[PDB]
Ligand binder design. Structure first.
Ligand SMILES: O=C(O)C(=O)c1ccccc1
Ligand SMILES: O=C(O)C(=O)c1ccccc1
Length: 305
């Protein structure tokens, strides 16, 4: 009657995302005895960051906390969730959530369960000051989130998982990196970060996913309980707006300088991120990308303007 599901984190255990995950697992377990439990396996030391998506697809683990940016090896469509401009509660009402799950099911043998990070724009962080929206000469650490935009800004790019960013900065292998507004202190990157470029762009996606067979094997009661707890997790996404503000102030206090462009240049920079981001998605998966685009836009922005 009680099922135990094995869950891995693609992010380091000392980061904010695992700090959010563990109290939720604790609640699931405390309230789920006799019904459903989650066995947290650990972070990248258990399964490498870029392998967690495949581990879920193949059932080596039941569940993961991960970003689609880390499992483009399963399906390139996985990276598209950075382009959401409505929050997950609204995605559940407008068909976006179901559309995501349809693709994840078919192309990845994966059920898309919940989004536990949103309202976290991405930024360029760098040690080489710029005064225009261009990165010529710079070598920047990335995941797939940033590839299209940073290449369009003339950056050289190199892929690393989050746990190798500190080392890349320490060795001076990169001038900078992409990351959300929040979290740069968790793995001590502030030590080697001089600037953050504004504005931010896209919206970070960190979600829970599950092996599709394992999801289908749940009893109705187990699935209903899991769903209740998944919505409980998402209801706490109000945190992210607070965290963004605190982290922005924390960077200023730490002496990280904000690079700002004028109003027109800033507006065009964020527009460019979305234009090239969607153009890349469209090349990668025309039908899925086009469909997601119509479901991911703000209600106020989806028609003629
Ligand atoms: O820069 C990354 O590693 C990345 O892709 C990501 C995605 C979501 C949240 C934080 C980082
Ligand atoms: O709201 C905060 O002060 C904040 O940034 C934070 C960070 C981690 C846990 C709790 C709060």
């Amino acid at each position: 009657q009680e099922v135990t599901l094995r869950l891995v984190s693609a992010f380091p255990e000392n980061g904010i995302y695992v700090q959010r995950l563990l109290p939720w697992i604790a609640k699931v377990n405390a309230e789920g005895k006799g019904v459903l439990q989650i066995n947290f396996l650990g972070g990248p030391k258990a399964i490498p960051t870029f392998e967690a998506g495949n581990a879920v697809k193949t059932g080596v683990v039941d569940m993961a906390m991960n970003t689609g940016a880390f499992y483009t090896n399963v399906m390139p469509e996985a990276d598209f969730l950075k382009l959401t401009q409505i929050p997950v509660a609204e995605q559940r009402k407008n068909g976006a959530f179901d559309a995501i799950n349809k693709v994840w099911n078919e192309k990845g043998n994966t059920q898309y369960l919940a989004r536990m990070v949103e309202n976290q724009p991405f930024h360029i962080y760098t040690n080489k000051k710029i005064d225009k929206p261009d990165l010529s000469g710079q070598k920047i650490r990335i995941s797939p989130v940033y590839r299209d935009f940073f290449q369009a800004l003339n950056a050289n790019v190199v892929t690393t998982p989050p746990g190798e960013v500190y080392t890349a900065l320490e060795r001076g292998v990169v001038d900078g990196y992409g990351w959300p507004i929040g979290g740069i202190f968790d793995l001590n990157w502030q030590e080697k970060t001089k600037f953050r470029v504004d504005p931010g762009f896209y919206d970070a996606e960190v979600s829970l996913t599950m092996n599709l067979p394992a999801y289908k094997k749940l009893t109705d009661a187990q699935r209903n309980y899991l769903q209740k707890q998944l919505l409980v997790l998402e209801a706490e996404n109000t945190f992210w707006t607070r965290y963004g503000n605190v982290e922005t102030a924390r960077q200023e206090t730490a002496g990280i300088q904000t690079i700002k462009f004028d109003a027109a240049t800033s507006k065009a920079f964020r527009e460019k991120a979305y234009e090239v981001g969607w153009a890349g998605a469209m090349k990668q998966s025309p039908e899925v990308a086009a469909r997601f685009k119509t479901l991911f836009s703000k209600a106020e922005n989806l028609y003629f303007q």
